[PDB]
Q: What sequence folds into this?
């Protein structure tokens, strides 16, 4: 079951500038003291990005997934739970599910009967789906999660779902602080599912401020700088 | 395969296999199986081709009904319980099961459908338990004249002949779709050598040269290195995680 | 169109499925009797044979409303013709019961044939004392006395039942539309509808 | 001639001799068609020429069952009563030939048979099978006129002896009256066993 | 209408278990029993 909640107050979400973040390693190749230029779907520097707030007022919009999504969160107390991907997000089509519950992470490809407001209930209550006909995939591994910043890039090409991530300590209620941090590859799954929209999951306080941002990836050309150790330290957008 | 019980003739259990490496070598190199027929492929080299999904159907039929399960064959069990399409990409495996499925006095735990309105469509399971009727006059839900029940039991006893003895049949179907392949055969790997001009195939990265120890510090996810000239000058062994 | 043959085929399939198991465990039980005769064994042979005969009689009844002219195939016609036969039940109950009780009489006392030697010191039966006398002998008087003694006794009691048995067999023969008992036994070599390969 | 051996069930399940655990059995060689691919074979066979021939009969007469075992259950029989019982006997005919025993090791490689030695084999098999053919035919003639009604009812047993004088060529030693029943001396008569099957 | 007959034309055969490839214009006439396993056939048909 799922509780229909309408206690939130309707507010117009703010916007932010994604200054430099959004760089990931394009290929599985080691380079030292070399400047390399590549063409791939990246997030343009100084880009228009949305803003969402949790904790009161909260919101879980069904944002589109057109060509890739840059996901970041500087929140605390691991309010962020997971994501849902798919085309219709109901029982007639397959949907991708990723949650980080109290003990483990669950990755499934099932035609869930998603409720309109997925929500996780100390104690937790799984209240995001109702049914599951048959799942063609499963996977369990290490969880992905003064404040802590978690950045993610979700790419889905040629039937492969790719995930990159990077964790770094952050302070203050500032949004998207300046700096550089490359996103190392984390997980690759050969599901082969169409994805058009996605939604995030949080947990109610009773029955800790959380904020997250959503970017978008576009075909661009970048110039990445490699140090001698093999780490990407700086990058240049070739059409800024 | 190594299962205690098998499904009924009319109701065949189907299991999907994916995302694992399949060692077929144990199958066709085993002499215990009495029937090993592969359609569309060869038992050898079969562990060199990749599919996306594999389906396994299990049931127990008669000794004379093993030849009845094949593309194009006709009969009672084949037409009305489990019918195979004319095209087939897989193998049919069957072996004698007298020691397990035969019991003194008759083993009547297995049922089957003998008469149906039409032959079953390929890869279709029929579990309907309805009073059949071959007469124009309806019997109105009770067995009467021209109204007979189509499901009867099998009798397995230790004294029957091999032609009537129980046989367990597993049908493996390899299907391929427009999705990344998930099932493949094992990748044989040889021992590595160093300080000798040899031909190397490092996880699909073929080449020729001399492999020595390395002082480079690869990142944990990186696999092979490259120079300014975009030529492979370093690599990491898939088995031992050291740089060469 | 629902030709009768299309339902008689299902009936024959059911008959085959039942009768195969019936005779198979009956024959499996039959083997256990020849190799082991006890009080339990004879009882279960009696039960199995009674059940098999009853089932065959029910199927003979069920074959009746499906006629023989509705099947054109000679081979399929043979199966129904063999199955359609009922037996002695065609006459009234009293005559059938007297048949069964007469057949019982020829089962019990008939097997107890005895002969009396002129000298009381030797007593021999048909198996094997008499058989030696008729077959394994080189004299005249022993064969003569054996013939006289055996035939003197058995004829008197056993003669009257034969005529009643013959007339009753004739009455069942007429009941099945046969001219006589000879035609009842002469029907095993009749071929009709095959053509010139007939008898 | 292409015929295979008995199934594997013969080797283990079937016993080639009488068991000696105190159980008494029927020692007559028997032909069993249990069905469902299950076949078992019983006789108290011995190392004798007569048992040597009955072993081939029991092996070969069962082979008829294997020939039509692919036929439907109601068609898993011989052509008629005589075909099944004649297939088995002709098998042992070849097994008793001098050449077969010479090539099988039962006869010396230099063994020569004399035409006088052949004379015994004729009389033996005639006396066993052929000598009763006129007797069997004319006895069945007697039954047929008994069945046809040619013989009047009041002389049913006395014409058996009356035509015996001229036609059967056998003279009775002492005439008997109407109360006597010579056929009652045979156990098969009371159980309704046909006699044309042998012919 | 010449080779195929109602009774059945079974005089035409083809080699299928060669175990190797064919060079251009190669003639293979050996009919020895193919072995698909480690156990030698030894002139008898059977597993592999
Ligand atoms: C692959 O599996 C083998 C099977 O045991 C692992 O074993 C290694 O074997 C090598 C030499 O045979 C040793 O030097 C290692 O110390 C063994 N490792 C362990 C953990 O026992 C091997 O580690 C496995 N390789 C990987 C990359 O997991
Ligand atoms: C981009 O973000 C800034 C921040 O407020 C602002 O210009 C506006 O919200 C965004 N631009 C749009 C939506 O065109
Ligand atoms: C978390 O998920 C695991 C399965 O991955 C389950 O066993 C456990 O009960 C779950 N815990 C909660 C609090 O939902
Ligand atoms: C209550 O939830 C159900 C589930 O979809 C649906 O009727 C609707 O989303 C909710 N009703 C409202 C918001 O009035
Ligand atoms: C899984 O569920 C879908 C419904 O979305 C159905 O079409 C499909 O046949 C199911 N697969 C299995 C193996 O049950
Ligand atoms: C996925 O989308 C592609 C085109 O974008 C289409 O060809 C394909 O049929 C779709 N598959 C499903 C399962 O929706
Ligand atoms: C390079 O990596 C080594 C090994 O950890 C470390 O000692 C060194 O400080 C690193 N140098 C730079 C510039 O990152
Ligand atoms: Zn015989």
A:
């Amino acid at each position: 079951q799922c509780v229909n909640l309408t206690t939130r107050t309707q507010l117009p979400p703010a916007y932010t500038n994604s200054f430099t973040r959004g760089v990931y390693y394009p290929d599985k190749v080691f380079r030292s003291s070399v400047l390399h230029s590549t063409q791939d779907l990246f997030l343009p520097f100084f880009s228009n990005v949305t803003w969402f707030h949790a904790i009161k007022r909260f919101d879980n919009p069904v944002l589109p997934f057109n060509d890739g999504v840059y996901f970041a969160s500087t929140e605390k107390s691991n309010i962020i739970r997971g994501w849902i991907f798919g085309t219709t997000l109901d029982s007639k089509t397959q949907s991708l599910l990723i949650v980080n519950n109290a003990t483990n992470v669950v990755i499934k490809v099932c035609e869930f009967q998603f409720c309109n407001d997925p929500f996780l209930g100390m104690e937790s209550e799984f209240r995001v789906y109702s049914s599951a006909n048959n799942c063609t995939f499963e996977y369990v591994s290490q969880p992905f999660l003064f404040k802590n910043l978690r950045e993610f890039v979700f790419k889905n090409i040629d039937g492969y779902f790719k995930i990159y991530s990077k964790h770094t300590p952050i302070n203050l209620v500032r949004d998207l602080p300046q700096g550089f941090s490359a996103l190392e590859p984390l997980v690759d799954l050969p599901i082969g599912i169409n994805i058009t929209r996605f939604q995030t999951l949080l947990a109610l306080h009773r029955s800790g401020a959380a904020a997250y941002y959503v970017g978008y990836l576009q075909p661009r050309t970048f110039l990445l700088k490699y140090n001698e150790n093999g780490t990407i330290t700086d990058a240049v957008d070739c059409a800024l | 395969f190594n299962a205690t019980r098998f499904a009924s003739v009319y109701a065949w259990n189907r299991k999907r296999i994916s995302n694992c490496v399949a060692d077929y070598s144990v199958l066709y190199n085993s002499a215990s199986f009495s029937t090993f027929k592969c359609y569309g492929v060869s038992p050898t080299k079969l562990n060199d081709l990749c599919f996306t999904n594999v389906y396994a159907d299990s049931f127990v039929i008669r000794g004379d009904e093993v030849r009845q399960i094949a593309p194009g064959q006709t009969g009672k069990i084949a037409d009305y319980n489990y019918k195979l399409p004319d095209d087939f990409t897989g193998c049919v495996i069957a072996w004698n099961s007298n020691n397990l499925d035969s019991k003194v006095g008759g083993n009547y735990n297995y049922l089957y459908r003998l008469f149906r309105k039409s032959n079953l469509k390929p890869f279709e399971r029929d579990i309907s338990t309805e009073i059949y009727q071959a007469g124009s006059t309806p019997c109105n839900g009770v067995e009467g004249f021209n109204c007979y029940f189509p499901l009867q039991s099998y009798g397995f006893q230790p004294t029957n002949g091999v032609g009537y003895q129980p046989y367990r049949v597993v049908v493996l179907s390899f299907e391929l779709l427009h999705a990344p392949a998930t099932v493949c055969g094992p990748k044989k790997s040889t021992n590595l050598v160093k300080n000798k001009c040899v031909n190397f195939n490092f996880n699909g990265l073929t080449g020729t040269g001399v492999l020595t120890e390395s002082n480079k510090k690869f990142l944990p996810f990186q696999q092979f290195g490259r120079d300014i000239a975009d030529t492979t000058d370093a690599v990491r062994d898939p088995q031992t995680l050291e740089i060469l | 169109q629902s030709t009768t043959e299309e339902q008689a085929k299902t009936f024959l399939l059911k008959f085959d499925h039942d009768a195969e198991d019936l005779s198979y465990q009956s024959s499996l039980a039959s083997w256990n009797y020849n190799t082991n005769i006890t009080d339990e064994n004879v009882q279960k042979m009696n039960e199995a044979r009674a059940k098999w005969s009853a089932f065959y009689e029910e199927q003979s009844k069920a074959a009746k409303m499906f006629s023989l002219e509705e099947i054109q195939d000679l081979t399929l016609k043979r199966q129904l013709q063999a199955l359609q036969q009922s037996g002695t039940s065609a006459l009234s109950a009293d005559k059938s019961k007297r048949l069964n009780t007469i057949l019982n009489t020829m089962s019990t006392i008939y097997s107890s044939g005895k002969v009396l030697d002129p000298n009381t010191q030797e007593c021999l039966v048909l198996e094997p004392g008499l058989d030696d006398i008729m077959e394994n002998s080189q004299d005249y008087s022993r064969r003569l006395w054996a013939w006289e003694g055996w035939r003197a006794e058995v004829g008197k009691q056993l003669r009257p039942l034969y005529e009643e048995y013959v007339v009753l067999e004739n009455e069942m023969a007429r009941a099945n539309n046969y001219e006589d008992y000879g035609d009842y036994w002469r029907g095993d070599y009749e071929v009709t509808g095959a053509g010139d390969y007939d008898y | 001639i292409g015929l295979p051996n008995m199934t594997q069930g013969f080797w283990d399940n079937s016993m080639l001799t009488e068991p000696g655990d105190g159980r008494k059995v029927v020692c007559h060689p028997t032909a069993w068609d249990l069905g469902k691919g299950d076949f078992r074979i019983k006789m108290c066979t011995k190392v004798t020429m007569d048992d040597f021939l009955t072993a081939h009969h029991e092996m070969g007469h069962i082979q008829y069952d294997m020939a039509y075992a692919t036929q439907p259950y109601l068609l898993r029989n011989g052509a008629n009563e005589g075909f099944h019982e004649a297939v088995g006997e002709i098998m042992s005919l070849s097994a008793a030939t001098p050449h077969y025993l010479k090539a099988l090791g039962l006869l010396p490689p230099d063994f020569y048979e004399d035409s006088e030695t052949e004379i015994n084999f004729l009389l033996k098999q005639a006396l066993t099978i052929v000598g009763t053919l006129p007797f069997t035919y004319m006895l069945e003639k007697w039954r047929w006129m008994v069945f046809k009604g040619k013989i009047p009812k009041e002389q049913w047993m006395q014409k058996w002896w009356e035509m015996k004088r001229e036609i059967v060529g056998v003279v009775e030693p002492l005439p008997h009256d109407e109360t006597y029943c010579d056929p009652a001396c045979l156990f098969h008569v009371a159980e309704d066993y046909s006699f044309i099957r042998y012919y």
The longest strand of chain A covers residues 147-157. The pocket of ligand 1 is lined by residues B 239 (CB under 6 Å). The radius of gyration of chain A is 18 Å.
